[PDB]
Design a protein. Structure first.
Length: 59
DNA sequence: CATTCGCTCTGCTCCTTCTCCCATCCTCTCGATGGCTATGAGATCAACT
């Protein structure tokens, strides 16, 4: 469907307004949800009220 | 004979360990699980006479 015009999409029975951005697995439309993670390669200093370390710096 | 010394016996902290628990009811969709071929010997007793 890449670069097709609205007329070409309609000829393929696709919807011009459909954004894409999903997969088809066994006929089911599957979307991937973005996962938050802590950023890499950055020094963070943290502390906790009830552990054997005063401060910890993690990378 | 008045210590004194040494030895046994509590019992008071401070871990480590480990076990337990985390609102009620209701609806829907979706993925997965989902298990030889065949020829022989040979024991049983259901069942004929």
């Amino acid at each position: 469907l890449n670069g097709l015009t609205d007329r070409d999409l309609c000829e393929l029975n696709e919807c011009p307004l459909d954004p894409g951005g999903y997969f088809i697995i066994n006929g089911s439309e599957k979307v991937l949800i973005a996962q938050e993670k802590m950023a890499t390669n950055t020094v963070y200093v943290f502390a906790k009220k009830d552990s054997k370390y005063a401060y910890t710096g993690e990378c």
